[PDB]
Design a protein around this ligand. Structure first.
Ligand code: A1B2O
Ligand code: ZN
Length: 140
């Protein structure tokens, strides 16, 4: 589990969005596994606006933050799970690192701020849904 809190927005994995989230929807994209809901209080996370390919992510199944190198956002095939059939997920970045299903939502950060959240993984890999292209998260 986990979320990004920027301005009056809450960014979570779409497959983990609560009942409170769909009743306050701003934008969602199933192909990206992202959902953004509106919040009453202002958040303090800064979104990175960069092309970094190294950062640090939080891994809840190990209670540890790990430094990682990751690929640029791309269209990647993701196996079937209880949340989606087998499909291509877009804007996904992969790294070599530990992840278990409940690690989704952990933040990936670089020197510029938040890059994305854990969204996929297994077999010694971890995949992150990029949020750096969502420029509107910074305004209105
Ligand atoms: C860190 S995800 C993970 C970890 C280890 C094993 C498997 C996983 N997968 C694949 C997983 O449970 N999902 C649920 C939905 C998600 C998605 N974006 O499609 C992927
Ligand atoms: Zn950066």
């Amino acid at each position: 589990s986990g979320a990004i809190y920027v301005g009056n927005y809450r960014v979570v994995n779409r497959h983990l969005a609560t009942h409170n989230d769909w009743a306050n929807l701003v934008w969602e994209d199933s192909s990206r596994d992202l959902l953004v809901s509106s919040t009453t209080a202002q958040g303090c996370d800064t979104i990175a606006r960069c092309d970094c390919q190294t950062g640090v992510y939080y891994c809840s199944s190990r209670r540890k933050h790990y430094p990682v190198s990751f690929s640029k956002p791309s269209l990647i095939f993701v196996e079937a799970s209880e949340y989606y059939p087998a499909r291509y997920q877009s804007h996904l970045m992969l790294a070599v690192g530990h992840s278990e299903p409940g690690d989704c939502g952990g933040i990936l950060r670089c020197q510029h701020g938040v890059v994305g959240i854990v969204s996929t993984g297994g077999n010694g890999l971890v995949g992150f849904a990029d949020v750096r292209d969502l420029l509107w998260l910074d305004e209105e």
